[PDB]
Enzyme design. Structure first.
Site, short mmCIF file in Angstrom:
data_model
loop_
_atom_site.label_atom_id
_atom_site.label_comp_id
_atom_site.label_asym_id
_atom_site.label_seq_id
_atom_site.Cartn_x
_atom_site.Cartn_y
_atom_site.Cartn_z
N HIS A 1 0.82 -1.20 0.00
CA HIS A 1 0.00 0.00 0.00
C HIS A 1 0.85 1.26 0.00
N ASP B 1 6.86 20.05 -29.15
CA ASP B 1 6.87 18.69 -28.62
C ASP B 1 7.90 18.62 -27.50
N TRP C 1 7.67 -0.01 3.45
CA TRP C 1 8.11 0.61 2.21
C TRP C 1 9.55 1.10 2.27
N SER D 1 12.59 5.00 -14.67
CA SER D 1 11.52 5.73 -15.34
C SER D 1 11.54 7.21 -14.97
N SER D 2 11.67 7.49 -13.67
CA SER D 2 11.63 8.88 -13.22
C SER D 2 12.86 9.65 -13.67
N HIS E 1 14.07 11.78 1.58
CA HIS E 1 13.49 13.08 1.91
C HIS E 1 13.38 14.05 0.74
N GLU F 1 12.54 12.87 -2.02
CA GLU F 1 11.42 12.19 -2.68
C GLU F 1 10.08 12.79 -2.27
N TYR G 1 9.55 15.90 -1.43
CA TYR G 1 9.40 17.21 -2.06
C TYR G 1 9.26 17.11 -3.56
N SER H 1 -1.01 27.32 -7.43
CA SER H 1 -0.73 28.66 -7.93
C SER H 1 -1.55 28.98 -9.18
N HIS I 1 16.70 13.56 9.93
CA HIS I 1 15.58 13.73 10.83
C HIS I 1 14.68 12.51 10.91
N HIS I 2 14.88 11.53 10.03
CA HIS I 2 14.25 10.21 10.15
C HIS I 2 15.05 9.25 11.01
N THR J 1 7.95 27.82 2.92
CA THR J 1 6.59 27.33 2.79
C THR J 1 5.59 28.35 3.33
N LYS K 1 5.15 30.93 0.72
CA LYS K 1 4.28 30.46 -0.36
C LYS K 1 2.81 30.51 0.04
N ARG L 1 3.29 2.35 15.37
CA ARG L 1 3.01 2.13 13.97
C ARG L 1 3.16 0.66 13.61
C1 HEA Z 1 0.40 8.98 -1.34
C2 HEA Z 1 0.37 8.89 -0.03
C3 HEA Z 1 -0.76 8.30 0.72
C4 HEA Z 1 -2.21 8.49 0.56
C5 HEA Z 1 -2.97 9.32 -0.43
C6 HEA Z 1 -2.71 7.61 1.66
C7 HEA Z 1 -4.15 7.45 1.90
C8 HEA Z 1 -4.81 6.75 3.01
N1 HEA Z 1 -4.11 6.02 3.92
FE1 HEA Z 1 -2.04 5.67 4.04
N2 HEA Z 1 0.05 5.32 4.06
C9 HEA Z 1 1.00 5.90 3.31
C10 HEA Z 1 0.71 6.95 2.33
C11 HEA Z 1 -0.61 7.39 1.87
N3 HEA Z 1 -1.77 6.98 2.41
C12 HEA Z 1 2.39 5.45 3.53
C13 HEA Z 1 3.64 5.93 2.84
C14 HEA Z 1 2.24 4.42 4.57
C15 HEA Z 1 3.32 3.59 5.24
C16 HEA Z 1 3.50 2.21 4.64
C17 HEA Z 1 4.63 1.54 5.38
O1 HEA Z 1 4.72 1.73 6.61
O2 HEA Z 1 5.44 0.83 4.76
C18 HEA Z 1 0.77 4.44 4.80
C19 HEA Z 1 0.12 3.57 5.77
C20 HEA Z 1 -1.23 3.83 6.27
C21 HEA Z 1 -1.62 3.60 7.68
C22 HEA Z 1 -0.77 3.15 8.82
C23 HEA Z 1 -0.94 1.65 8.93
C24 HEA Z 1 0.15 1.10 9.80
O3 HEA Z 1 0.80 1.88 10.52
O4 HEA Z 1 0.35 -0.13 9.77
C25 HEA Z 1 -3.05 3.94 7.71
C26 HEA Z 1 -3.88 3.89 8.94
O5 HEA Z 1 -4.90 4.54 9.05
C27 HEA Z 1 -3.43 4.36 6.34
C28 HEA Z 1 -4.78 4.73 5.90
C29 HEA Z 1 -5.08 5.57 4.75
C30 HEA Z 1 -6.46 5.97 4.43
C31 HEA Z 1 -7.71 5.61 5.18
C32 HEA Z 1 -6.29 6.80 3.22
C33 HEA Z 1 -7.38 7.46 2.46
O6 HEA Z 1 -7.01 8.77 2.03
C34 HEA Z 1 -7.83 6.59 1.30
C35 HEA Z 1 -7.33 7.06 -0.07
C36 HEA Z 1 -8.35 7.97 -0.71
C37 HEA Z 1 -8.03 8.72 -1.78
C38 HEA Z 1 -9.06 9.62 -2.39
C39 HEA Z 1 -6.64 8.66 -2.38
C40 HEA Z 1 -6.67 8.00 -3.75
C41 HEA Z 1 -6.47 9.05 -4.81
C42 HEA Z 1 -6.98 8.95 -6.05
C43 HEA Z 1 -7.80 7.76 -6.45
C44 HEA Z 1 -6.72 10.07 -7.03
C45 HEA Z 1 -6.29 9.52 -8.38
C46 HEA Z 1 -6.96 10.37 -9.44
C47 HEA Z 1 -6.37 10.68 -10.59
C48 HEA Z 1 -4.98 10.21 -10.91
C49 HEA Z 1 -7.11 11.52 -11.58
N4 HEA Z 1 -2.33 4.23 5.38
C1 HEA Z 2 4.07 15.37 0.97
C2 HEA Z 2 5.21 14.95 1.49
C3 HEA Z 2 5.80 15.55 2.71
C4 HEA Z 2 6.02 16.97 3.00
C5 HEA Z 2 5.75 18.22 2.21
C6 HEA Z 2 6.61 16.88 4.35
C7 HEA Z 2 7.01 18.11 5.05
C8 HEA Z 2 7.71 18.24 6.33
N1 HEA Z 2 7.99 17.18 7.11
FE1 HEA Z 2 7.57 15.14 6.76
N2 HEA Z 2 7.20 13.11 6.30
C9 HEA Z 2 6.68 12.57 5.18
C10 HEA Z 2 6.24 13.37 4.03
C11 HEA Z 2 6.29 14.84 3.91
N3 HEA Z 2 6.77 15.65 4.88
C12 HEA Z 2 6.57 11.09 5.15
C13 HEA Z 2 6.01 10.22 4.06
C14 HEA Z 2 7.09 10.71 6.47
C15 HEA Z 2 7.25 9.35 7.10
C16 HEA Z 2 8.26 8.48 6.38
C17 HEA Z 2 8.14 7.09 6.93
O1 HEA Z 2 8.82 6.77 7.92
O2 HEA Z 2 7.35 6.31 6.37
C18 HEA Z 2 7.44 12.02 7.06
C19 HEA Z 2 8.02 12.12 8.39
C20 HEA Z 2 8.67 13.32 8.90
C21 HEA Z 2 9.75 13.28 9.92
C22 HEA Z 2 10.40 12.07 10.53
C23 HEA Z 2 9.58 11.62 11.72
C24 HEA Z 2 9.74 10.14 11.95
O3 HEA Z 2 9.47 9.36 11.02
O4 HEA Z 2 10.12 9.76 13.07
C25 HEA Z 2 10.04 14.70 10.18
C26 HEA Z 2 11.08 15.19 11.13
O5 HEA Z 2 11.64 16.25 10.97
C27 HEA Z 2 9.15 15.51 9.31
C28 HEA Z 2 9.11 16.97 9.30
C29 HEA Z 2 8.63 17.75 8.16
C30 HEA Z 2 8.77 19.23 8.10
C31 HEA Z 2 9.41 20.18 9.07
C32 HEA Z 2 8.13 19.57 6.83
C33 HEA Z 2 7.99 20.92 6.25
O6 HEA Z 2 8.33 20.94 4.86
C34 HEA Z 2 6.57 21.44 6.44
C35 HEA Z 2 6.61 22.95 6.28
C36 HEA Z 2 5.25 23.61 6.36
C37 HEA Z 2 4.88 24.29 7.46
C38 HEA Z 2 5.80 24.39 8.64
C39 HEA Z 2 3.53 24.95 7.53
C40 HEA Z 2 3.53 26.24 6.72
C41 HEA Z 2 4.26 27.35 7.44
C42 HEA Z 2 3.65 28.46 7.89
C43 HEA Z 2 2.18 28.65 7.69
C44 HEA Z 2 4.46 29.53 8.58
C45 HEA Z 2 4.41 29.35 10.10
C46 HEA Z 2 5.45 28.36 10.56
C47 HEA Z 2 6.24 28.62 11.61
C48 HEA Z 2 6.11 29.90 12.37
C49 HEA Z 2 7.27 27.62 12.04
N4 HEA Z 2 8.19 14.68 8.58
CU CU Z 3 11.41 13.73 5.97
#
Ligand code: HEA
Ligand code: HEA
Ligand code: CU
Ligand code: PC7
Ligand code: PGT
Ligand code: PTY
Ligand code: PTY
Ligand code: 3PH
Ligand code: 3PH
Ligand code: MG
Lengths: 38, 90, 50, 52, 104, 76, 51, 504, 85, 266
Positions: H60, H90, H125, H153-154, H235, H237, H239, H250, H284-285, H310, H313, H432
C-alpha cells in the site's frame, strides 16, 4: 474603429480594499490566537 | 528593427520591429495561416503576459490595455531575420 | 474522426456508443483496482490453510 | 609499454598464503553461489579448509 | 484575466453564478453527502458485525466489571501495588498505592 | 536570470548558516575518536581521552551554563 | 490476562529498576532491528545487531 | 497502435493520468483492509496473520507513493501541460518519453507479483535490513526490482523535462514569463536527477547483500549506512511529490481570483530554497538509531528552516486571493482546502523536527497523521484540483458541478475524521505498523475506521461526475493552454507562438 | 504509565527528561495555535470580503515589499526561539 | 510517401527547427524486455533451474531493441532531420545523464568512505581486516591510470582535429586504450587474493571497480559506434561529441575511484 482592450484592474486602494481594514483584521486575528495560546 | 545583436537568427522578426502599433498604424503580423497566437506583455509590467489570437481580415485589435495594435497578414514566407535581412544589410 | 490531422486529437462525441463503452471501461477499471488486493489476500491465506 | 610488459608477467607467480577462516572471510549467509561453490574469477581459493 | 473566466464559465455551464459563496445550493449537497455517510456507516457496521475472527476475552462484561472494581491499579511482584498515572487521576504525593493508604 | 527580491537574501542567511554547519559537521568527523583503523589508538590513554573529551566539549560547552539552569523550554 | 492486567501490554517477567539511581541501559539485538520504547520514562532507542 | 506507439506528449500524459488512477484504486483497496483490520481490538478479517498485514502495508505504501502521486503530477500533468505552457511543439526526446511511461507497468506488475510469491515482501516501504535480508524466497527481490524500474523511469522523464525547458522555449520568452507550474516541474526534475541514483546504489547494495553474500549491511557491515543512503534519497522524494501541487495551486488560485500570482520571484525563490534544503536535512528520520548528539543537534536545527519558504508560499497564495474578484468553483475549493489543510500538515512537521519531542512520537501514529495530512490532503487535493480545472481540455469531457461538490465534501469530511484522531493515538503512545493494539485505544480507532469508509465512498462517487462538454471559441488568456480549443489538435501550436516585448 | 481511553495528550512521566520533552512540545504548540488562528481567520475574511458580488473588478497588487519582509522575518525569529531550548 | 516529405516540409520543417518523430514500437518492447529480464534475474538469484537462461534471454532482447532504436536514430541523422539546436539538445541530455551517473557513483563511494573509516567490533576494529592483502597503488593500477590518462588525451585530440584521418586514428587509439584498461582489470580480478564475499573491503572494491569497468565498456562501445558513422560520411555530429563527453566523464570517475579505494585503502 478598432478593437480595444478593456480596463481590467483598479489601482490598489480605490476599489474594494479601501473598506477592508487589513491591519484591523490582522490585529483581531493575532488577539484571538494569543488569547487561545495563553 | 531593434538591434539584432544577441538575437537568434531564426526568431522571425516583426517581433523585433522598432514601432509602437497605433490604431492608425498597426503592427502587421505575418502568418502562414488564417489565425495565429501571439503573446504581448503588459507595458507597465514585464512579468505579466497576455496571449491573444489574431484572425485574417479583421480590424486592428489591442490585447493589453495601453498596448500596441495588431493586424494579421497571410503570407507564404516569413522572413527568418538574422540571415534574411541582415545578410542583405540594406 | 481524424485524430492526427483534424482539429481535435480526441473527439469523444463521435465514437459510436461512447457512453456505454466509457462506463464499461470505468467499471472494469474499478473492479480490477478494487479486487486485485482481495485476490492477493485470498491467495496467501489459502496456502496457510492447507 | 608497461601494460604489454604486464601481459607477459601475468598468471605465472603464485601465492601459498593460506588464510584462517575468520568471521569476515568467505561469508555464506546463503549456501554456495548462484554459479557454483567457489567465487567467480576465483581459480585459486585461499581461505583454508580443514582448519587445524 | 476576465476572458478566460468567461470562457471557462461557458464550457462548464452547470457551475452557477448567482452571487453567493456556495453556488450549488445546499438542498442538493446535504442529502447526497448524508446518503454517502449512511452508506459508509453501513459498511463500517458490516465490518464490525460480520468480519471478526477473534473477540478478546478482556472486553467481556464480566472482565470489564471485575476490572472496574479494581481501578487503575498495578500489582508488583516485589512491592505493594501502585496507582497508575497519578497526575491525571489526581492522587496526592503522600499516597502511593491502595494497600499502603489504609484509609482512616 | 531574474533579480532576486529582498526576501530571498533573508532566506539565504539561514541557508548559508545551514550549509556552513553541514560542511563543518562533515569535516569534523574524520578528526574524532572512533574513526581510527587500529586497536593501537586506545593503548595511549592520555591522548585518546584528551581527544575524546575535546570532541565532547565542542558545541556542548556553549550549552553547559543553560543545561545547569534547566533552560530547556521557551517558557519556564 | 486476568482483571487488573492490561491486554497486549503485559509480560511474564518484568524489568526491576531502583529509583533515584543513575542506570546505564545498553540496548542491542541479535537477529533483526528492534526498539526499546517506554513512553513513561521518555526512552526510545533502537536495538541494532552489532551496536 | 495509437496508445502503444505514441510519440506525442498529450497521449503519454493521458496514459500517465489513467495509470495513476489505477494505482490510486489499488492503494485505496489496500487501505480499506488496513482500516478494517484496525477497527476493533483483537483479530479482524486477516485471521491473526501479521506477515500478511506487513505485506499489505508495504504494498500500500509503495503503490500510493510511487505509482499514484508521482505519475499523476510529474508524468501526468507535466507531460501534457509543459510544452503547451512554454510554447514548445513537442518534447525534446519523444521516444524517450514513451519508454519513460512504458517502464511503469512492468514495475507495477513485479510489485503485484511479489505479493503472490512465497509469503510476500513484508518489510515496510523503507525495506530496512536485516529484515529484508532474512526473508527467504524471491518476493523481496521482485519488490526491489520494481523500485529500480520506477526509479529509472523517473530519471529518464526528468532528463526529457530538463532538456525541454532549457532548449525548446518560445522566442521572446525567458525564464521569467513561464508560469509557476513549469518552474515546479523543472525543480522537481532537478531533484529527481540528483536524488534517485542514491536510491539505486542503496538497492544494488541490498541485492548483493541478499543474494551475493556480500558485506554491505550485515554482521561485519553497518546497518545505519542503509538508513543514511535511503533517507538521503527519501526526503527529497517527498518534495518531488509536493512541488507540482504547489504549481497547480498557484495556477488555480490565480485563475479564479482574476489576479496574477503575488510575489512571483518570491515564489520561485521559495521553491528553490525548499529544493536546496531538502538534501541536507535527511537524518531527521534517524533520531532514535543512536547517532552522536552533534549530528542530532545539526539535523534538528536545519530541518526547522524549511518552514519559512513554505510560509511565504502560503501567505503569497493568500495575498493572491486578497483584493481580487473571486468566484468559488470546484477546483477553487480544492485549492482553498489545500492552503487551509496543508498548514495542519506542516505544523506537526515542525514538532517532529525537534528531536527531544521526536523521542516520544517516533514510529507512532502522530507521524502517520502528519504525513497523511501532507499527502492525502496536499497532493491528492492538488491532483483533484487540476482534474476539474484542465479536464475538459485534456479528455474532452465536462463534469457536473453538483456531483463534484458532493465528492469534494465527502472526501473533505472523510479525511478530517480518519487522521485527526490518529494524532491523539500517537501522543498516547500507539505504535506504527501494528494490527493488534491495547484495549484503551479503541475509540479513536473506531472513529478513524469510520472516516476511511467515507473516503472510499467519495472514491466511488468520483466516477459519476463526468458528462459531455460544451465547446466554445477562445480569444485571450493569461496562459497558453486557455487559448487552445478543447481538445486541441494532435500537433497543437501549428505555428510556434512568439512573445513580443512592447516599447513599454 | 499506561494509556487511557479517549486520551488526547501524552502519558504521565517518571523522569525529568520526559517532562522536559513534553514541556518543549507544549511550548511549540503555543506558537502553532497562533499561526493556525491567523491563517484560518485571514482566509475566512479574504474569502467573504472579496466575493465577486462585492467586487466590481479586482485591484492590481503583485508585490508588497514590506509585508513580504515581515512574513519572512517573523517566522525565522520563531524558529531560532524554538531551536535553542 | 512522396507527399509525406512534402507534408512534413509544409507543416513541420519550414515552421520550426525541431524534430517531430513518427510513431515507434521500441519503447514498449524495451519495457517488457526489462520485465522478462527482471523475472529471469530474480529466478537466477535463488538457483531456480532455467533462470539464468531466461535472464540472458531478456537481456538479449533489450540489447536488440536498443540496437535497432539507435540504428533508427543514426538513419534519422543521415537524412538531415537534425538541425544545430537539436544537436545542442542532444549534448544537454548527455549532460543530464552524466549528472545522474555521477550521483550513482557518489552513493557508491559513500559506502567505501563509511565502511573504511570506522571499522567495527565484528572486524575486531581493524581496517583492512586481517588476512586481506590490499591491492597496491605502486603497481599495475598505476599503469592503468597512465593508460586511461593517455586515452583521455587521445580522445581530446579527435574533438578538435579537422583532418578526417587524424580523427579516425585518434578514435581508434582511444578505443584500443580503453580495451587495454579492461583486459588488465580482468587480470586484477584474477590475481587478487580476496573475493567479493571476503570482508566489506573486498565487497566495496569489487562492486565499485565492476561498475566502473561496466561504464568503461559502455563508453568504448559508444566510441566504436561513433567511429563507423564517421568512417562512412566523414561526419558524426552529436555522436562524436557526446561519446567524447561520456569518455571524459568515465576518466574523471576513475580519479575518485583510484584516490578513494587504491590510495586511501578504503
Ligand atoms: C500517497 C500517499 C498516501 C495516501 C494518499 C494515503 C491514503 C490513506 N491512507 Fe495511508 N500510508 C502511506 C501513504 C498514503 N496513504 C504510507 C507511505 C504508509 C506507510 C506504509 C509503510 O509503513 O510501509 C501508509 C500507511 C497507512 C496507515 C498506517 C498503517 C500502519 O501503521 O500499519 C493507515 C492507517 O490509518 C493508512 C490509511 C489511509 C487511508 C484511510 C487513506 C485514504 O485517504 C484513502 C485514499 C483515498 C483517496 C481519495 C486517495 C486515492 C487518490 C486517487 C484515487 C486520485 C487519483 C486520481 C487521478 C490520478 C485523476 N495508510
Ligand atoms: C508530501 C510529502 C511531505 C512533506 C511536504 C513533508 C514536510 C515536512 N515534514 Fe515530513 N514526512 C513525510 C512526508 C512529507 N513531509 C513522510 C512520508 C514521512 C514518514 C516516512 C516514513 O517513515 O514512512 C514524514 C516524516 C517526517 C519526519 C520524521 C519523523 C519520523 O518518522 O520519526 C520529520 C522530522 O523532521 C518531518 C518533518 C517535516 C517538516 C518540518 C516539513 C515541512 O516541509 C513542512 C513545512 C510547512 C509548514 C511548517 C507549515 C507552513 C508554514 C507556515 C504557515 C508559517 C508558520 C510556521 C512557523 C512559524 C514555524 N516529517
Ligand atoms: Cu522527511
Ligand atoms: C564512518 C562512519 C560514520 C560517518 C558519518 O556519516 O558520520 C555522521 C555521524 O555519525 C555518528 O553518529 C558519528 C560517527 C560514528 C556524520 O553526519 P552525517 O549527516 O551522516 O554526515 C554527512 C554526510 N556524509 C556521510 C556524506 C559526510
Ligand atoms: C534501452 C533504452 C535506450 C534508450 C535510448 C535513448 O534514450 O536514446 C535517446 C537519447 O537520449 C538522450 O538524450 C541521452 C540519454 C541516454 C539514456 C540511456 C538510458 C540507459 C539506461 C540504462 C534517443 O532519443 P529519441 O529516442 O527520442 O530519438 C531522438 C531523435 O533521434 C531526435 O529527436
Ligand atoms: C486553543 C486550545 C486551548 C486548550 C485549553 C484546554 C486544554 O489544554 O485542555 C486539554 C485540551 O487538549 C487538546 O485539545 C489538545 C489537542 C492537541 C491536538 C494535536 C494535533 C496537532 C494538529 C495540528 C495543530 C492543530 C485537555 O486534554 P487532557 O489533558 O484532558 O487530555 C489528556 C488527558 N490524559
Ligand atoms: C537492476 C540494477 C542492477 C542490479 C543487479 C546486479 C547484480 C549483479 C551481481 C553480480 C555480482 C558478481 C560478483 C562476482 O563474483 O564478480 C566479482 C566482480 O564483480 C563485479 O565486477 C560486479 C560488477 C557488477 C556489479 C553489480 C569478482 O569475482 P570475485 O569477487 O569472486 O573474484 C575474486 C577473485 N579472486
Ligand atoms: C466493482 C464495482 C464497480 C463500480 C463502478 C462505479 C461507476 C460505474 C457505474 C456508475 C453508474 C453511473 O454513473 O450512473 C449515473 C449515470 C449518469 O446519471 P443519469 O444519466 O442522470 O442517471 O447514469 C447513466 O447514464 C447510466 C446509463 C446506463 C449504464 C448501464 C450500462 C453500462 C453499465 C456499466 C457498469 C459495469 C458493467 C459490468 C462491468 C464489469 C467488468 C467487465
Ligand atoms: C551507454 C549509455 C549512453 C548511450 C547514449 C545514447 C545517445 C543517443 C543519442 O543521443 O542519439 C543521438 C545520436 C544521433 O547522432 P547524429 O548522427 O548526429 O544524428 O544517436 C546515435 O546515432 C547514437 C546512438 C548510440 C550508439 C550506440 C551506443 C552504444 C552503447 C553501449 C552498447
Ligand atoms: Mg523508526
Amino acid at each position: 474603429k478598432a478593437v480595444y482592450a478593456p480596463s481590467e484592474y483598479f489601482k490598489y486602494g480605490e476599489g474594494a480594499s479601501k473598506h477592508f481594514g487589513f491591519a484591523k483584521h490582522v490585529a483581531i486575528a493575532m488577539t484571538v490566537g494569543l488569547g487561545l495560546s495563553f | 528593427y531593434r538591434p539584432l545583436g544577441d538575437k537568434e537568427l531564426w526568431h522571425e522578426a516583426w517581433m523585433y520591429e522598432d514601432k509602437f502599433g497605433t490604431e492608425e498604424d498597426p503592427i502587421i503580423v505575418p502568418s502562414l495561416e488564417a489565425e495565429r497566437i501571439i503573446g504581448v506583455t503588459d507595458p507597465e509590467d514585464e512579468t505579466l503576459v497576455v496571449w491573444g489570437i489574431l484572425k485574417d481580415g479583421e480590424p486592428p485589435r489591442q490585447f493589453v490595455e495601453n498596448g500596441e495594435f495588431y493586424v494579421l497578414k497571410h503570407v507564404e514566407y516569413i522572413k527568418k531575420v538574422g540571415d534574411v535581412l541582415e545578410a542583405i544589410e540594406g | 474522426y481524424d485524430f492526427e490531422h483534424g482539429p481535435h486529437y480526441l473527439q469523444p462525441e463521435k465514437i459510436p456508443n461512447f457512453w456505454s463503452k466509457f462506463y464499461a471501461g470505468t467499471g472494469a477499471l474499478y473492479a480490477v483496482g478494487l479486487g486485485v488486493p482481495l485476490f492477493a489476500v485470498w491467495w496467501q491465506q489459502s496456502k496457510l490453510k492447507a | 609499454a608497461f601494460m604489454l610488459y604486464d601481459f607477459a608477467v601475468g598468471l605465472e607467480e603464485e601465492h601459498h598464503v593460506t588464510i584462517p577462516p575468520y568471521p569476515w572471510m568467505r561469508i555464506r549467509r546463503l549456501p554456495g553461489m548462484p554459479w557454483g561453490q567457489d567465487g567467480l574469477f576465483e581459480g585459486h581459493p585461499r581461505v583454508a579448509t580443514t582448519w587445524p | 484575466a476576465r476572458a478566460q473566466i468567461e470562457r471557462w464559465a461557458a464550457e462548464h455551464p452547470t457551475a452557477p453564478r448567482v452571487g453567493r459563496i456556495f453556488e450549488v445550493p445546499l438542498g442538493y449537497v446535504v442529502p447526497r453527502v448524508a446518503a454517502g455517510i449512511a452508506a459508509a456507516g453501513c459498511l463500517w457496521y458490516m465490518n464490525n458485525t460480520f468480519l471478526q475472527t477473534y473477540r478478546p476475552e478482556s472486553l467481556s462484561k464480566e472482565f470489564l466489571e471485575e476490572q472496574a472494581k479494581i481501578g487503575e491499579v498495578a500489582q508488583r511482584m516485589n512491592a505493594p501495588p501502585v496507582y497508575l498515572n497519578p497526575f491525571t487521576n489526581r492522587i496526592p504525593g503522600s499516597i502511593l498505592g491502595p494497600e499502603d493508604a489504609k484509609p482512616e | 536570470p531574474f533579480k532576486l527580491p529582498l526576501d530571498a537574501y533573508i532566506l539565504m542567511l539561514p541557508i548559508t548558516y545551514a550549509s556552513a554547519a553541514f560542511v563543518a559537521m562533515c569535516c569534523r568527523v574524520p578528526t574524532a575518536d572512533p574513526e581510527t583503523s587500529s586497536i593501537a589508538y586506545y593503548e595511549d590513554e592520555q591522548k585518546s581521552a584528551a581527544a575524546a573529551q575535546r570532541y565532547d566539549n565542542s558545541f556542548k560547552q556553549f550549552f553547559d551554563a543553560r543545561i545547569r539552569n534547566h533552560k530547556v523550554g521557551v517558557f519556564q | 490476562v486476568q482483571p487488573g492486567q492490561l491486554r497486549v501490554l503485559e509480560v511474564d517477567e518484568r524489568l526491576v529498576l531502583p529509583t533515584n539511581t543513575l542506570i546505564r541501559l545498553l540496548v542491542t539485538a541479535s537477529d533483526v532491528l528492534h526498539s526499546w520504547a517506554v513512553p513513561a520514562l521518555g526512552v526510545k532507542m533502537d536495538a541494532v545487531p552489532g551496536r | 497502435m495509437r496508445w502503444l506507439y505514441s510519440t506525442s506528449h498529450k497521449d503519454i500524459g493521458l496514459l500517465y493520468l489513467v495509470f495513476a488512477f489505477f494505482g490510486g484504486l489499488l492503494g485505496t483497496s489496500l487501505s480499506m483492509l488496513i482500516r478494517y483490520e484496525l477497527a476493533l481490538p483483537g483479530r479482524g478479517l486477516l485471521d491473526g496473520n501479521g506477515q500478511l498485514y506487513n505485506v499489505i502495508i508495504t504494498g500500500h505504501g509503495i503503490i500510493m507513493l510511487l505509482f499514484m502521486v508521482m505519475p499523476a503530477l510529474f508524468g501526468g500533468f507535466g507531460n501534457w501541460l509543459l510544452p503547451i505552457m512554454i510554447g514548445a511543439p513537442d518534447m525534446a526526446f519523444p521516444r524517450l518519453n514513451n519508454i519513460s511511461f512504458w517502464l511503469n507497468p512492468p514495475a507495477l506488475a513485479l510489485l503485484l507479483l511479489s505479493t503472490l510469491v512465497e509469503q510476500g515482501p513484508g518489510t515496510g516501504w523503507t525495506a530496512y535490513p536485516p529484515l529484508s535480508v532474512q526473508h527467504s524466497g524471491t518476493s523481496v527481490d521482485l519488490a526491489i526490482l520494481s523500485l529500480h524500474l520506477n526509479g529509472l523511469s523517473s530519471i529518464l522523464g526528468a532528463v526529457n523535462m530538463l532538456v525541454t525547458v532549457a532548449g525548446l522555449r518560445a522566442p521572446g520568452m525567458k525564464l521569467l514569463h513561464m508560469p509557476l507550474f513549469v518552474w515546479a516541474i523543472a525543480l522537481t526534475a532537478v531533484l529527481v536527477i540528483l536524488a534517485v541514483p542514491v536510491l539505486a546504489a542503496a538497492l544494488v547494495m541490498l541485492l548483493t547483500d541478499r543474494n551475493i553474500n556480500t558485506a554491505y549491511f550485515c554482521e561485519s557491515g553497518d546497518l545505519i549506512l542503509y538508513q543514511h543512503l535511503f533517507w538521503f534519497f527519501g526526503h527529497p522524494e517527498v518534495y518531488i511529490l509536493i512541488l507540482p501541487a504547489f504549481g497547480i495551486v498557484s495556477q488555480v488560485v490565480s485563475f479564479f481570483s482574476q489576479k496574477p500570482v503575488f510575489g512571483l520571484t518570491g515564489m520561485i525563490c521559495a521553491m528553490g530554497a525548499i529544493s536546496l534544503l531538502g538534501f541536507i536535512v535527511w537524518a531527521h528520520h534517524m533520531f532514535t538509531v543512536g547517532l552522536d548528539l552533534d549530528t542530532v543537534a545539526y539535523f534538528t536545527s536545519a530541518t526547522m528552516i524549511i518552514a519559512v519558504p513554505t510560509g511565504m508560499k502560503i501567505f503569497s497564495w493568500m495575498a493572491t486571493i486578497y483584493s481580487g474578484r473571486v468566484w468559488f468553483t470546484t477546483p477553487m475549493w480544492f485549492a482553498v482546502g489545500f492552503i487551509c489543510l496543508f498548514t495542519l500538515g506542516g505544523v506537526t512537521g515542525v514538532v517532529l523536527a525537534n528531536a527531544g519531542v521526536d523521542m516520544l512520537v517516533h514510529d507512532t501514529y502522530y507521524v502517520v497523521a502528519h504525513f497523511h495530512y501532507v499527502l492525502s490532503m496536499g497532493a491528492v487535493f492538488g491532483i483533484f484540483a487540476g482534474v476539474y480545472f484542465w479536464g475538459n481540455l485534456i479528455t474532452g469531457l465536462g463534469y457536473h458541478e453538483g456531483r463534484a461538490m458532493v465528492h469534494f465534501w465527502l472526501l473533505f469530511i472523510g479525511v478530517n475524521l480518519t487522521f485527526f484522531p490518529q494524532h491523539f493515538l500517537g501522543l498516547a503512545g500507539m505504535p506504527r505498523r501494528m494490527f493488534d493494539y491495547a484495549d484503551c485505544f479503541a475509540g479513536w480507532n473506531a472513529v478513524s475506521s469510520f472516516g476511511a469508509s467515507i473516503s472510499f465512498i467519495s472514491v466511488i462517487v468520483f466516477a459519476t461526475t463526468f458528462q459531455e462538454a460544451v465547446r466554445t471559441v477562445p480569444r485571450t488568456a493569461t496562459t497558453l493552454e486557455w487559448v487552445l480549443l478543447a481538445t486541441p489538435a494532435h500537433h497543437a501550436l501549428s505555428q510556434v507562438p512568439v512573445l513580443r516585448t512592447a516599447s513599454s | 504509565d499506561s494509556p487511557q481511553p479517549w486520551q488526547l495528550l501524552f502519558q504521565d512521566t517518571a523522569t525529568s527528561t520526559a517532562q522536559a520533552m513534553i514541556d518543549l512540545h507544549h511550548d511549540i504548540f503555543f506558537f502553532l495555535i497562533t499561526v493556525v488562528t491567523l491563517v484560518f481567520y485571514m482566509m475566512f475574511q479574504i474569502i467573504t470580503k472579496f466575493h465577486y458580488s462585492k467586487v466590481l473588478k479586482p485591484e492590481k497588487l503583485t508585490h508588497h515589499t514590506t509585508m513580504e519582509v515581515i512574513w519572512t522575518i517573523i517566522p525565522t525569529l520563531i524558529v531560532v526561539m524554538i531551536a535553542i531550548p | 510517401h512522396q507527399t509525406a516529405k512534402e507534408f512534413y516540409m509544409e507543416h513541420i520543417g519550414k515552421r520550426h527547427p525541431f524534430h517531430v518523430l513518427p510513431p515507434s514500437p521500441w519503447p514498449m518492447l524495451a519495457g517488457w524486455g526489462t520485465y522478462v529480464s527482471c523475472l529471469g534475474m530474480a529466478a537466477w538469484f535463488h538457483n531456480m533451474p532455467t533462470g539464468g537462461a531466461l535472464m540472458a534471454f531478456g537481456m538479449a532482447n533489450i540489447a536488440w531493441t536498443a540496437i535497432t532504436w539507435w540504428r533508427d536514430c543514426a538513419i534519422e541523422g543521415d537524412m538531415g532531420m537534425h538541425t544545430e539546436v537539436v544537436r545542442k539538445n542532444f549534448i544537454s541530455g548527455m549532460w543530464a545523464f552524466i549528472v545522474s551517473e555521477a550521483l550513482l557513483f557518489v552513493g557508491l563511494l559513500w559506502a567505501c568512505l563509511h565502511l573504511g573509516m570506522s571499522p567495527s567490533v565484528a572486524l575486531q576494529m581493524q581496517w583492512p581486516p586481517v588476512g586481506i592483502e590490499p591491492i597496491g597503488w605502486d603497481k599495475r593500477a598505476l599503469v592503468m591510470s597512465a593508460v586511461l590518462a593517455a586515452s583521455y588525451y587521445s580522445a581530446n585530440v579527435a574533438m578538435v582535429a579537422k583532418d578526417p584521418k587524424v580523427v579516425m586514428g585518434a578514435l581508434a587509439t582511444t578505443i584500443g586504450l580503453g580495451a587495454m584498461f579492461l583486459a588488465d582489470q580482468y587480470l586484477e580480478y584474477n590475481e587478487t587474493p580476496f573475493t567479493i564475499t571476503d570482508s566489506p573491503y573486498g565487497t566495496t572494491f569489487f562492486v565499485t571497480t565492476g561498475f566502473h569497468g561496466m561504464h568503461v565498456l559502455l563508453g568504448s562501445l559508444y566510441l566504436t559506434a561513433a567511429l563507423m558513422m564517421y568512417k562512412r560520411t566523414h561526419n558524426a555530429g552529436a555522436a562524436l561529441k557526446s561519446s567524447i563527453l561520456y569518455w571524459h566523464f568515465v576518466d574523471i570517475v576513475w580519479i575518485a575511484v583510484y584516490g578513494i579505494i587504491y590510495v586511501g585503502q578504503y
